[PDB]
């Protein structure tokens, strides 16, 4: 009866049944092997700790995120993620539900075949389907027109959709935010003398990337007032006991996301990739893409957006057009709140990939 929406995060894999509150389980996706000699012969050690337990056992493991630059590293670690996810979080057999899985918008072939094929043969689910994470964010806002953003550590996307059709010729996938912001924050915190190099400790960079950082309203003028002897210092306390006072770098990192020339690649900022996707749509429709600019994904949770994004777009777009950007709370779970809306509905009860048709057809059932 009830389906399961399990969202293949780039973070942060999310799992929870169909409808209607929030995901049951969210955890850092990491697998970590034990890297030092064991001297208490108890000992009960497992092949790999997943997160949560690999985030409560930091500093004695070697963290490996199973998804990197929007593609999964190997299914040897991924299947162990799956077994962990269903069993010690949700507490339900995969043989008892049609499931609903997600992938990234514009992802390499044959990563959807190899996925579809392994998951049926390993867990023997009743039926399954794969929806792209951006499209679902329409449902969470109730839109009938507008551009959708799935931005996670570390692949973002920019997809424009009109009532009620998607355009194959206007979609942009950037492998640019947010895990490159994580590496950049580590590159500019070494710049003020606090040295971080170890895999486990890299999570601490993510926790200050979450909490303390923000986006400026105008870069050049926040940079000017930063030069003052006036304080921008916020004091963090670290696990070992150490105290870090950061100022300039705090607004530098998530400002980072405009002008990717700060790293140095030729790709233009979210400012322009948003715009270049809009001006790749048909002429009459462009009118209603304005004011249906909907941000989404957890890496948009800096408090300095969306009115930075707004002030920048309104300057570049044609004059006298009413352009607003929709940014509410919930954005980290937006995609999931999409999936949640879908899987309870009819007619889409009959659009699942059923087991007999999968057996006859094989993995080549992409279209």
């Amino acid at each position: 009866t009830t389906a399961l929406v399990c969202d293949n995060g780039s973070g942060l894999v999310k799992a929870g049944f169909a409808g209607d509150d929030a995901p049951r389980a969210v955890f850092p996706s990491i697998v970590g092997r034990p890297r030092h000699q064991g001297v208490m012969v108890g000992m009960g050690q497992k092949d790999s700790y997943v997160g949560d337990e690999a985030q409560s056992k930091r500093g004695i493991l070697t963290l490996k995120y199973p998804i990197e630059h929007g593609i999964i590293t190997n299914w040897d670690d991924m299947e162990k993620i799956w077994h962990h996810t269903f069993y010690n979080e949700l507490r339900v057999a995969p043989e008892e539900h049609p499931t609903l899985l997600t992938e990234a918008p514009l992802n390499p072939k044959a990563n959807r075949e190899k996925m579809t094929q392994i998951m049926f043969e390993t867990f023997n689910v009743p039926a399954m389907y794969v929806a792209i994470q951006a499209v679902l964010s329409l449902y969470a806002s109730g839109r009938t027109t507008g551009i959708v953003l799935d931005s996670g550590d570390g692949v973002t996307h920019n997809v424009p959709i009109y009532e009620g059709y998607a355009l194959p010729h206007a979609i942009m996938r950037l492998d640019l935010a947010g895990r490159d912001l994580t590496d950049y924050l580590m590159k500019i915190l070494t710049e003020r003398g606090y040295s971080f190099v170890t895999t486990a400790e890299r999570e601490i960079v993510r926790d200050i990337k979450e909490k303390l950082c923000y986006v400026a309203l105008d870069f050049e003028n926040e940079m000017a007032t930063a030069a003052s002897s006036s304080s921008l210092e916020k004091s963090y306390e670290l696990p070992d006991g150490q105290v870090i006072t950061i100022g300039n770098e705090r607004f530098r990192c998530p400002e980072t996301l405009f002008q990717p020339s700060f790293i140095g690649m030729e790709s233009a900022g979210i400012h322009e990739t948003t715009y270049n996707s809009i001006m790749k749509c048909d002429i009459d429709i462009r009118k209603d893409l304005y004011a249906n600019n909907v941000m989404s994904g957890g890496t948009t949770m800096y408090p300095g957006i969306a009115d930075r994004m707004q002030k920048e777009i309104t300057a570049l777009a044609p004059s006298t057009m009413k352009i607003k950007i929709i940014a509410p709370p919930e954005r980290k779970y937006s995609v999931w709140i999409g999936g949640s809306i879908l899987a309870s509905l009819s007619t889409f009860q009959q659009m699942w990939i059923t087991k007999q048709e999968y057996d006859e057809a094989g993995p080549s059932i992409v279209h």
Binding site: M40, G42, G44, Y87, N88, R91, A93
Partner: protein
Amino acid sequence: VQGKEERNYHIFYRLCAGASEDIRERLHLSSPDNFRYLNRGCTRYFANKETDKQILQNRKSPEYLKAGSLKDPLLDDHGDFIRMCTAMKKIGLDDEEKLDLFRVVAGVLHLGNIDFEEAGSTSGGCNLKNKSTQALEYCAELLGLDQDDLRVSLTTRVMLTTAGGAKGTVIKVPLKVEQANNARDALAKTVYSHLFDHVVNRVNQCFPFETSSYFIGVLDIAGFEYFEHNSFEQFCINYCNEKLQQFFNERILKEEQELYQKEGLGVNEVHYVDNQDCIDLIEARLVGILDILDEENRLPQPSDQHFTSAVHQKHKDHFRLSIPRKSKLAIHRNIRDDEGFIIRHFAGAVCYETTQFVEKNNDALHMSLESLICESRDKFIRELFESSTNNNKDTKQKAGKLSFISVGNKFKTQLNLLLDKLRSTGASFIRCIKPNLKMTSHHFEGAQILSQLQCSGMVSVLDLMQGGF
């Protein structure tokens, strides 16, 4: 440690319910919510309409105010305490010694509240809590102990260095907080254990035997009890019924072997109903499930999740054991891998969860406290923990070895003292069937009888018997 909606023993409810104010003033009792060995489960009394009017307001807990007396047509926890003392007049006990059989019981109840915090890092150890100061004073006059000597004795490990050269002496090493919670409850499972052995030995001297030779006895014990969830109390019952099932089928095959060749109806054979693979699974040395449990207590820091992964570590084979999520019945598929197991027995597949499983097993009555309750400052009490009148053990305190002592072994070892006594005797198996749920006349339930035919070992007799005579 009493499970959810369960109670302790019945003397810990009949003394609370049936005590008058001329009995409560000499024992200092209060309502069941106060005592930790009573608030853990259910605090309600069994009663009938007439005695429901007589239960005092100061003997009622918040649960008693909310849900009232429990309805049962024969148990009366307020009234049967009156009819208990009529039977103590009949059996062979006087009223002064009956009063001494109420002082020991009330001392167990005021033991059930002591708490132990972590010391102020004054060279390690644990200390008692400030809420436990008046709670130790109201316990030590019941168990006959000194309040200044008992505070040391509940917190330290006393040993000696005297064994060869130099100056020998007795040093004191404090115990950890979790080791003090397991040690404080170990005294309550020792004092009530020797009190029940004093009532039965007193009853056996009320009608003493003339001599001994042959004997015909009746063994009655709890059946194959299995519920919605199965506890540590139900793991030792279903292991005890499996061994009694081993000797049961052993006597049935031997009767058929001594009848068809003795009344001359030919020779025959049958595939015996072996349960040795189920027995080795539950109790085998080093690899068995009960063998991993008594070893698990010895580890530096006990856990119940580390115990569970070790069960399917060593039992990676054996058909009669599977993971809890594999369950035939849907109800136990909400359990996770390191939280339970399913063991098939002669009554079918019974799942047990492992939450708090190790915590209920880990008893440890250390030197400093076993050699304090034996030196009690009351005289009826010192006779209870031996040396006995006949067959005196005389265990001295000056010895060393063994400290904690095995405890997951005492439930199997004490059962082996009866199974080999049964193996030398004949047997007369009387199976009792309950026909209905309410215990009402003329009623029959084919929704209640058939489950007791399949969980009383009766099916195993019918699938062994294939004689055709």
